[PDB]
């Protein structure tokens, strides 16, 4: 490796490290984007029923961070795993419909 | 990175409040309520 303190200018005013960007911390734009994405997903999940939106939220990990299995979400709502699978299917279907009309979430696909 | 104690950051001028007469009387009658 090379030293971050390697001089740049001819006078000693300047370090090489100083021309090196930080790629780790999210830019203000990045942060803003994930914010708008959480808010837009939340806007789109309110056009569902509380149960089907909760099913998608528990299935994709938006709730506790973990993505639950169909048997677990079906055990949570007290229904059959096939039933919760179908509630999931119609939820996702309604989301695709509202998306098709509103155009709102498309831009976030990069 | 604090707000300096001079100009608009002075303890002399910085706590100054603005309120319009409508909101002012609206509060004034509410504190005259109790």
């Amino acid at each position: 490796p090379v030293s971050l303190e390697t001089p740049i200018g001819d006078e000693k005013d300047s370090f090489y490290g100083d021309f090196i960007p930080d790629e780790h911390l999210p830019s203000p734009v990045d942060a803003a984007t994930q914010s708008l994405l959480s808010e837009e997903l939340e806007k789109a999940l309110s056009k569902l029923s509380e149960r089907e939106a909760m099913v998608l939220k528990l299935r994709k990990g938006l709730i506790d961070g973990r993505e639950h299995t169909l048997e677990e979400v079906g055990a949570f709502f007290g229904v059959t795993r096939e039933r919760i699978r179908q509630i999931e299917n119609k939820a996702l279907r309604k989301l695709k419909y509202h998306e098709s009309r509103t155009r709102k979430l498309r831009d976030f696909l990069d | 990175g604090r707000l300096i104690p001079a100009g608009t950051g002075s303890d002399f001028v910085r706590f100054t409040q603005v309120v319009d007469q409508k909101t002012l009387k609206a509060i004034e009658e509410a504190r005259k309520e109790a």
């Binding site: - | 100054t16 309120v19 007469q21 909101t23």
Partner: protein, 94 residues
């Protein structure tokens, strides 16, 4: 020069106090969507677009013009902060 700046300075013991008043008032206008303004319809700050005259979006232009009218009361310890904010939220929700 900001219109009426001399009178504006006339109003306060310290110019920095003028600045604070104007800034806070503009925060209020911004928060309440201007619905709380002390300006009459014909006193409203205007901006000329392509289409036509629209309300001036600049809240500080507004706040200053308001301050010029006399309709605003400024000072220290006029009213508890939470109470002011709540009475304003009641009077002009948003």
């Amino acid at each position: 020069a900001e219109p009426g700046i001399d009178k504006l300075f006339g109003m306060v013991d310290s110019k920095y106090r003028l600045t604070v008043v104007v800034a806070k008032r503009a925060q209020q206008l911004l928060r309440h969507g201007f619905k709380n303004t002390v300006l009459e319809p014909e006193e409203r700050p205007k901006m000329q677009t392509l289409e036509g005259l629209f309300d001036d979006p600049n809240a500080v232009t507004w706040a200053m013009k308001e301050l010029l009218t006399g309709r605003l009361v400024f000072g220290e310890n006029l009213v508890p902060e939470d109470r002011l904010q709540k009475e304003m939220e009641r009077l002009y929700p948003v």
